[PDB]
């Protein structure tokens, strides 16, 4: 019977996905295919023309091309493209001797959550990594309870001739939903920094990406319960505008 189910389920066929861009009419919908462009579509059945709403992931049809189901939603490799590890492996103490930071960061990171009396914008490590340095993040991540979300850089725009905010906003939004979350962006000079001649190597990709954070930071997007740890081994390697408050309220030394 188990195998039979598997046997049977081979009749059960795949059904396309998309978010509702909007509701044209009660049935009539503007939905960009999660695979591709927009389409005018109708409802189907077991469908709540009520519930059907902007940005709502829905199952879609291959031929009828309409809703095949209404859906929850989330995207991206949370543990891979996003990197999802909860808190950190060893606490701040095990790497102690950075204690200045240890305290100093905790108060400007962990606490502002638990004391409604700005929240902090951003915090940037620098100095040699992994000294406990990279570990700090985990040790940081450990202390708060938030989900530590690690960001390596270039994957956020490999090639992949695009994927910027969609990446980062999933990193934002998932965390924004999954908050408390720690956002830790590794050594961000490929997707961070002021670039070069500021010419186009695809640097225009970087600047965007460079700005996508800026947009989330100098933009109204806050760290609700999700916080962002910036990482660099050298600080001076970053966009001056990035260092700015409204983006970074802490420049974290590690002597």
């Amino acid at each position: 019977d188990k195998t039979e189910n598997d046997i049977k389920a081979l009749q059960s066929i795949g059904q396309l996905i998309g978010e509702v861009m909007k509701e044209l009419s009660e049935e009539k919908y503007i939905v960009k295919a999660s695979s591709g462009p927009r389409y005018i579509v109708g409802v189907r059945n077991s469908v709540d023309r009520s519930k059907l709403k902007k940005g709502v992931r829905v199952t879609l049809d291959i031929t009828t091309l309409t809703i095949m189901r209404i859906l929850p939603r989330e995207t991206d490799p949370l543990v891979y493209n996003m990197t999802s590890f909860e808190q950190g492996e060893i606490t701040f103490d095990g790497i102690g001797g950075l204690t200045e930071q240890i305290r100093e960061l905790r108060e400007v990171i962990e606490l502002p959550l638990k004391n409604p009396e700005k929240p902090p914008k951003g915090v940037l490590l620098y100095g040699p990594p992994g000294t406990g340095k990279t570990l700090l993040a985990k040790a940081v991540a450990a202390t708060i309870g938030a989900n530590f979300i690690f960001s390596p850089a270039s994957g956020i725009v490999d090639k992949y001739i695009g994927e910027s905010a969609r990446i980062i906003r999933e990193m934002f939004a998932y965390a924004k939903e999954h908050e408390p979350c720690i956002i830790f962006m590794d050594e961000v000079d490929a997707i961070g920094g002021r670039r070069f001649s500021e010419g186009t190597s695809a640097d225009r990709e970087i600047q965007r990406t460079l700005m996508e954070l800026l947009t989330q930071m100098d933009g109204f997007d806050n760290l609700g319960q999700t916080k962002i740890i910036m990482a660099t081994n050298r600080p001076d390697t970053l966009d001056p505008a990035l260092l700015r408050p409204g983006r970074l309220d802490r420049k974290v030394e590690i002597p």
Partner: protein, 161 residues
């Protein structure tokens, strides 16, 4: 009349070739000579439009008044922004400047205005604060948003947005 029908494909109208002939854009990237409503002509036909497209008859079913957020990647909207102005203190000249630049001419001339400097410094805050008071439909955009492989859509709502 009855030949119209629903389960269509979205697109963007480009330009009429003649009356009852025009080129549109496909969300799929096609753009082609198609037929249209006998309904719209030149009047009710509109210069570019989000448009209802027959699939294999592949023709224009209708213009579309609505929507927004294909990719592109949407539009930044805080409708009624949360920022009062003068909340980065002393921007008066600049505050008046924007006001001079936009807030006033909104009533009564530039089509566009450049904010220059480090943003989010209060600089970006200028916008929302302004955008707050302005009581117009606000649209934030990120150049850092238009980065979708679908090089076919791209400007499409950038126009329509």
């Amino acid at each position: 009349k009855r030949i119209q029908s629903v389960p269509l494909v979205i697109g963007q109208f480009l330009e009429p070739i003649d009356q009852n002939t025009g080129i549109v854009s496909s969300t799929t990237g096609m753009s082609y000579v198609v037929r249209i409503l006998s309904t719209l002509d030149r009047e009710l036909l509109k210069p570019s439009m989000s448009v209802a497209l027959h699939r294999h008859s592949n023709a224009l079913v209708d213009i579309l008044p609505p929507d927004s957020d294909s990719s592109i990647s949407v539009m930044g909207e805080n409708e009624k922004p949360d920022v009062t102005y003068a909340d980065v203190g002393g921007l008066d000249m600049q505050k008046q400047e924007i006001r001079e630049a936009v807030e006033l001419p909104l009533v009564q001339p530039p089509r566009g205005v450049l904010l220059y400097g480090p943003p989010g410094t209060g600089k970006t805050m200028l916008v929302k604060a302004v955008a707050n008071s302005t009581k117009a439909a606000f649209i934030r955009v990120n150049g850092s948003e238009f980065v979708h492989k679908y090089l076919g859509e791209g400007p499409r709502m950038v126009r329509d947005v």
